[PDB]
Design a protein around this ligand. Structure first.
Ligand code: MG
Ligand code: MG
Ligand code: MG
Ligand code: MG
Ligand code: MG
Ligand code: MG
Ligand code: MG
Ligand code: MG
Ligand code: MG
Ligand code: MG
Ligand code: MG
Ligand code: MG
Ligand code: MG
Ligand code: MG
Ligand code: MG
Ligand code: MG
Ligand code: MG
Ligand code: MG
Ligand code: MG
Ligand code: MG
Ligand code: MG
Ligand code: MG
Ligand code: MG
Ligand code: MG
Ligand code: MG
Ligand code: MG
Ligand code: MG
Ligand code: MG
Ligand code: MG
Ligand code: MG
Ligand code: MG
Ligand code: MG
Ligand code: MG
Ligand code: MG
Ligand code: MG
Ligand code: MG
Ligand code: MG
Ligand code: MG
Ligand code: MG
Ligand code: MG
Ligand code: MG
Ligand code: MG
Ligand code: MG
Ligand code: MG
Ligand code: MG
Ligand code: MG
Ligand code: MG
Ligand code: MG
Ligand code: MG
Ligand code: MG
Ligand code: MG
Ligand code: MG
Ligand code: MG
Ligand code: MG
Ligand code: MG
Ligand code: MG
Ligand code: MG
Ligand code: MG
Ligand code: MG
Ligand code: MG
Ligand code: MG
Ligand code: MG
Ligand code: MG
Ligand code: MG
Ligand code: MG
Ligand code: MG
Ligand code: MG
Ligand code: MG
Ligand code: MG
Ligand code: MG
Ligand code: MG
Ligand code: MG
Ligand code: MG
Ligand code: MG
Ligand code: MG
Ligand code: MG
Ligand code: MG
Ligand code: MG
Ligand code: MG
Ligand code: MG
Ligand code: MG
Ligand code: MG
Ligand code: MG
Ligand code: MG
Ligand code: MG
Ligand code: MG
Ligand code: MG
Ligand code: MG
Ligand code: MG
Ligand code: MG
Ligand code: MG
Ligand code: MG
Ligand code: MG
Ligand code: MG
Ligand code: MG
Ligand code: MG
Ligand code: MG
Ligand code: MG
Ligand code: MG
Ligand code: MG
Ligand code: MG
Ligand code: MG
Ligand code: MG
Ligand code: MG
Lengths: 49, 72
RNA sequence: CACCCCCGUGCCCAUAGCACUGUGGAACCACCCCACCCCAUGCCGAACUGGGUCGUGAAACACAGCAGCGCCAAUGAUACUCGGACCGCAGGGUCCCGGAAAAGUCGGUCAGCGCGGGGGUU
RNA sequence: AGUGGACGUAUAGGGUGUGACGCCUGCCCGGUGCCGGAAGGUCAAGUGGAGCGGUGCAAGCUGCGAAAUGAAGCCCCGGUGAACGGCGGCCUAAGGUAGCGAAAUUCCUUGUCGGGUAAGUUCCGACCUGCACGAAAGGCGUAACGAUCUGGGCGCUGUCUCAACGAGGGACUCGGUGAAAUUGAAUUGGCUGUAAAGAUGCGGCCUACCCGUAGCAGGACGAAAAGACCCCGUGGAGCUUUACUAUAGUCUGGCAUUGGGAUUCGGGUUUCUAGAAACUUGGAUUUCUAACCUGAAAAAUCACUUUCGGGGACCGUGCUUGGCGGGUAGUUUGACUGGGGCGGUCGCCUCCCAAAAUGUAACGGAGGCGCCCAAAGGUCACCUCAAGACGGUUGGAAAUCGUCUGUAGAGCGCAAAGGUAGAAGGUGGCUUGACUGCGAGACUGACACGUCGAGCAGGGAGGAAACUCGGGCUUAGUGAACCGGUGGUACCGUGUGGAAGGGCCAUCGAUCAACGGAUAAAAGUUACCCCGGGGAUAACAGGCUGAUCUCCCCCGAGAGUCCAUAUCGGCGGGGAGGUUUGGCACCUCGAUGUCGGCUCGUCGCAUCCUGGGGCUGAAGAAGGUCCCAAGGGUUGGGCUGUUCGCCCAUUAAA
RNA sequence: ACGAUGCGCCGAAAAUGAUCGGGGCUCAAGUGAUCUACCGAAGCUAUGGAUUCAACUCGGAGUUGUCUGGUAGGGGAGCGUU
RNA sequence: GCGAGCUUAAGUUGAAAAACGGAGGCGGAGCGAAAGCGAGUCCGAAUAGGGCGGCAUUAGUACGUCGGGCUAGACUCGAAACCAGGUGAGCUAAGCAUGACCAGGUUGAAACCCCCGGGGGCGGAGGACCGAACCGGUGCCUGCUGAAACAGUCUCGGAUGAGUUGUGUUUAGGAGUGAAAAGCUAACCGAACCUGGAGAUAGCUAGUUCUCCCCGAAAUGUAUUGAGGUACAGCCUCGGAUGUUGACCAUGUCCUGUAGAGCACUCACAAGGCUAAAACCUUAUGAAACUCCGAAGGGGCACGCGUUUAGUCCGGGAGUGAGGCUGCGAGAGCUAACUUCCGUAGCCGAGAGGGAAACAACCCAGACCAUCAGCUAAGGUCCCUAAAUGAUCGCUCAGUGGUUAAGGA
RNA sequence: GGAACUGAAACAUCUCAGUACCUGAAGGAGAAGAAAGAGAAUUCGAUUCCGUUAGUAGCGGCGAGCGAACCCGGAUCAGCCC
């Protein structure tokens, strides 16, 4: 198995994926950050995958 | 044993009395063996590089109180 | 920078610091003064903090004395060493020239320079 | 095709292993093999084609494509040993039935006792503590047999003490014929030193008239075969197997050769008062004789006919499927390494070594990493830690609170060094800069990688702002390149338009850890060995060293009743010699023959005898021990290849 | 009488034949201190001579200086044979 | 030669001679992954860069010669092997068909017949006995450039059987045959021979010849199925450009944590006082991984305030990547080694000449040539053997000189 | 029908190579040949051979390496029969 994993993060409207490790450790489900790809402003990123 | 690790050629890369271009690296260090005077800015691994072109000068009362300024 | 003194903020960057200690007083600063609220304490207006006089120089702080402590610190002499030139089988060591500490003694100091302001001799 | 088995047919033929005869042949089906079973698991092509897509106006064409159904075979379950085997280490399937045992098996080992010899490492018989016996890779016996091996005894011997005399064929001399391996060139001595460390050839010193001839076998590291031992070569070959890969062969499903039919049909169509006759597309047993195979009759193999006889749509063969496949075949089987092997190591981080720049080796001295953290980040704001003493509730050396001291004696996620008190340590509020596009400048590296990085854009986050954010105090938390997966993008996309496929940006797959990484895919063995090389490199011998070995000397505790030193000398120290086991790797792998014996010897002296002494715990005698002394001398046998050692029996002494 | 020291004695045995290189040396040829005088190299100086380079002159030549140990190697000028 | 252009190939026509032949090649524009834009271009949402032109527009191209590179035997010789198609059973390993051979002597199985399994006769069996041929090779010796490429004398095995032997014949290369050694297969069988592939490959060895001039190395670093081999640096040389940038030495400045030295922290540790002994004080010490300290030196910069001549880059060719000693400084070792591994200087490698008897490394001194010239270095001056049996104050009477120490006198 | 050394610095795909070799048919030659083609201009108009395109395209453990064709230029050019 593994503990930590490399999870992906698609934007609302889905153009992009930033990919970085979380860890099943403290993060038992949560994955909600933000970044700017195709749109100007940084947008919400649901790092579920 | 018989193990060992690569050299990290650290040092005072630029010695006082050396003109320096902006972005020249002047001291390499594990930490703040030098503490960066006026004109200099210290990086992530605590190497400190000049920002402004000019002469390099050592402020140095020592005992962790050594600083590197650059004079234009 | 007329003379002192206070509040602050620098340079310096323990020869400036500690302790013993004495002066200080509503001028400055400081505690005490109260707290539903601004604001805050992972409990306490102790800390921030907001509303103020008395009171008091107690404590803290400022300023003087102070060589018990720390801090600095020669000269002199070495240690060591650059070059030169040697001995000992060896560990090791010597000589010539020149650079030369560390520790200790002698002795030095409870500092030294600014800038703005406040109140004094009215 | 044809043959052998075999013109044989289960009392025969093939294979495997034991190896007359005798008494016998125990335990253990767990793995492996094989033989049975075959409820279930898995498993190819094929049958099926539900759906997912292109491309066309569409008909249609076309790329993928499940579920179910598909054999052997493996997983599973029994069993099988005169199957492969196992029957031991202060739980495994079991743990040794008989018989034997110091063995052809015994390391310690010359085991202990007895036998035999004056003396027995051998041998024989007992014992058993069987390193490391054992029952058809057979256990225990066995008469007879053996150019078999071992031990003994008789007999006789020149095997020997110890050699002598004789014969003949050489050998030698004369005449005739007359080669060979070899050969840098030779005007080619002894010592001692020196040099690549074994000198005729370099140094000194000694000796030596020129030349033969018969002899010997120390030297010329003599001769001969570019070491068969050892190491190396990304050499070779033979052999092995549960290394890899294939594959003859071999088993299995489907299709063709290959067919009528009855019989049960999950189903097809037009057929008809949920229904069945014409009929199947198949499958399934069963059966049939024209395909085919095979056998008998004047016509031996073959063809005909066969009153014919048997099998039979199987067997055989063609394609294709999946399995078995050391029988065959082609190969893989790492390096460093004070010789190879074994052990260890292979990448990154920290310190010392590292000789005050950077750098620097070692199978040198120490230890870490193959990750973590949704907050251990960004920012804003706020706290200050060990430890001690006095005092204290159930606790008391150390819980917890309270005062005093407290540039840190703490902490910093893991290892340490640096660093840190105005914080990187501790504690909250907000949110993600754990951003996209860039990169002036440098550090570092052979490259390739790697490190740091001001500032600009778009846009965020915190702060009232200055400002700070493109990860963590820092230094480890990692692998180019190829081949592919997933999401975007709209660059190529072969006549054109599309699509298939490809490119790009993102991301995923690596103890490829032998960590710059030979393939997608790989172990042994050689003593039957072969080649090419190496004194680049071991075994011997010489050399250098001298830890270990041999020896001496100093001291002096005590022993010696007494008295250190007649003798002996703790615990420590100093030297010598090069004889031991070594280290090192210097000459020698186009060759330096190695252990023991035998034969010749010669030298040292640290002296076993003999000679001269001193002291003595020397009355005498026999001694002890030290000094001077190398002329000579120092025995014969049993045991073992032995050196050695033990023993017999003597010695001036062995 | 303990001491510092200068030069020496003992301590101090290996293997074919000895030795400081030999002779021989104290009636110094040992030694420590000084001072000369000479020997002594392919180093340096003299005379002659030729190359490499470079300046300097005339349409390689000549002058002045200078240089010339050499393995793997790089460069250059040339001699011999068909 | 022609030059912003330059030139053919195949061929055609001529040949005692060469011309024609422009298909085609190179220069002229680059950036990009490509579409594609174009002195601009890729990355990107615009500005920060990369390559590129301007600028120095550095002129190209067809030949010749030569240095290198590639590919092919590719400087020459040299494998053990592998594969293909053949040739071989006239040797030898077996089979088959068919013929032949085995003196002589010993022993006396059954069966058969008498007297009671036993005795007698009789008979003539056997992988029986002895021993010639013959077949075979057991032990010593000789032979060992042989008489002989496997024998000879003597000794030994069998010798009616699983025997010997003729002829003819069959079986062969991963194949045959094998009472089993991997033995035999035409005198080298763990895979014959011949021809061929084929000049296999060879990171391995050896060898590579005419002369003179000039310069002159390396045995280091990193990477490697790498270590005795290669790649890239490092060092050499040739040419072009640059133009003192070099180099030593001096001044100025900065950086360093060694020697030493110290305990202020860490480990250790020496005698005491103090005390529920950690702690504490007086005194006393060691430290590669201890540092309150801390030189000499050393490195970077700048100058040249001073003598010198190297340097830098760019293009062609290399080799070297095995080092050896000594001294100093460390590690490893035993404070061993002509030991092993690093730093550093010098020599040797690549070095001649004088000294050190001799002697790559030590001490002196870098050989252009010639001289029957002079001064010197190290080292020397009794004879060998060149040069003071020099001078002056001593020292040692030991041949010390001309081989150590603790210790004694 | 069909190698293997060899290269790949090992070695399986790969190459070495349809090389060597064996075997068959045949001639002075042979083969091939008169487009159900190349190809992208609605061109070409049999086959063979040279130059070239060109180491371009492309194939490849995308490794060692392997490598076209069209256009165009020449040599020769006849299409005939069922
Ligand atoms: Mg170790
Ligand atoms: Mg002084
Ligand atoms: Mg000096
Ligand atoms: Mg010195
Ligand atoms: Mg001095
Ligand atoms: Mg057997
Ligand atoms: Mg015994
Ligand atoms: Mg025995
Ligand atoms: Mg037995
Ligand atoms: Mg006995
Ligand atoms: Mg016995
Ligand atoms: Mg058995
Ligand atoms: Mg047996
Ligand atoms: Mg017998
Ligand atoms: Mg026999
Ligand atoms: Mg006997
Ligand atoms: Mg006689
Ligand atoms: Mg005679
Ligand atoms: Mg004669
Ligand atoms: Mg004659
Ligand atoms: Mg010697
Ligand atoms: Mg020598
Ligand atoms: Mg001689
Ligand atoms: Mg001579
Ligand atoms: Mg002889
Ligand atoms: Mg050899
Ligand atoms: Mg060999
Ligand atoms: Mg091999
Ligand atoms: Mg098959
Ligand atoms: Mg298959
Ligand atoms: Mg095999
Ligand atoms: Mg190896
Ligand atoms: Mg350093
Ligand atoms: Mg090195
Ligand atoms: Mg902070
Ligand atoms: Mg920034
Ligand atoms: Mg911004
Ligand atoms: Mg705001
Ligand atoms: Mg995609
Ligand atoms: Mg790979
Ligand atoms: Mg590597
Ligand atoms: Mg053999
Ligand atoms: Mg050799
Ligand atoms: Mg050697
Ligand atoms: Mg040896
Ligand atoms: Mg030995
Ligand atoms: Mg030889
Ligand atoms: Mg020889
Ligand atoms: Mg004696
Ligand atoms: Mg006596
Ligand atoms: Mg007596
Ligand atoms: Mg003797
Ligand atoms: Mg005199
Ligand atoms: Mg003179
Ligand atoms: Mg001279
Ligand atoms: Mg000269
Ligand atoms: Mg002249
Ligand atoms: Mg020269
Ligand atoms: Mg010279
Ligand atoms: Mg020369
Ligand atoms: Mg440019
Ligand atoms: Mg040319
Ligand atoms: Mg050349
Ligand atoms: Mg080249
Ligand atoms: Mg060859
Ligand atoms: Mg017989
Ligand atoms: Mg008998
Ligand atoms: Mg025989
Ligand atoms: Mg007999
Ligand atoms: Mg062959
Ligand atoms: Mg076979
Ligand atoms: Mg033979
Ligand atoms: Mg070939
Ligand atoms: Mg190498
Ligand atoms: Mg290179
Ligand atoms: Mg420069
Ligand atoms: Mg300069
Ligand atoms: Mg020290
Ligand atoms: Mg240094
Ligand atoms: Mg200047
Ligand atoms: Mg070059
Ligand atoms: Mg090397
Ligand atoms: Mg070295
Ligand atoms: Mg040691
Ligand atoms: Mg050495
Ligand atoms: Mg060595
Ligand atoms: Mg050499
Ligand atoms: Mg030299
Ligand atoms: Mg010399
Ligand atoms: Mg000498
Ligand atoms: Mg001489
Ligand atoms: Mg020599
Ligand atoms: Mg020499
Ligand atoms: Mg030497
Ligand atoms: Mg000298
Ligand atoms: Mg002279
Ligand atoms: Mg002199
Ligand atoms: Mg004389
Ligand atoms: Mg002494
Ligand atoms: Mg290869
Ligand atoms: Mg191969
Ligand atoms: Mg052919
Ligand atoms: Mg032919
Ligand atoms: Mg023919």
């Amino acid at each position: 198995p593994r503990i930590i994993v490399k999870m992906e993060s698609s934007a609302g409207t889905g153009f992009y994926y930033t990919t970085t490790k979380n860890r099943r450790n403290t993060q038992a489900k949560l994955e909600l950050k933000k970044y700017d790809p195709v749109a100007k402003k940084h947008v919400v990123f649901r790092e579920k995958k | 044993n018989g193990r060992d690790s690569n050299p990290k050629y650290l040092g005072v890369k630029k010695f006082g009395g050396e003109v320096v271009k902006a972005g020249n690296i002047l001291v390499r260090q594990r930490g703040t063996k030098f503490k960066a005077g006026q004109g200099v800015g210290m990086g992530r691994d605590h190497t400190l590089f000049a920002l402004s072109d000019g002469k390099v000068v050592f402020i140095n009362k020592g005992k962790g109180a050594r600083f590197i300024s650059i004079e234009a």
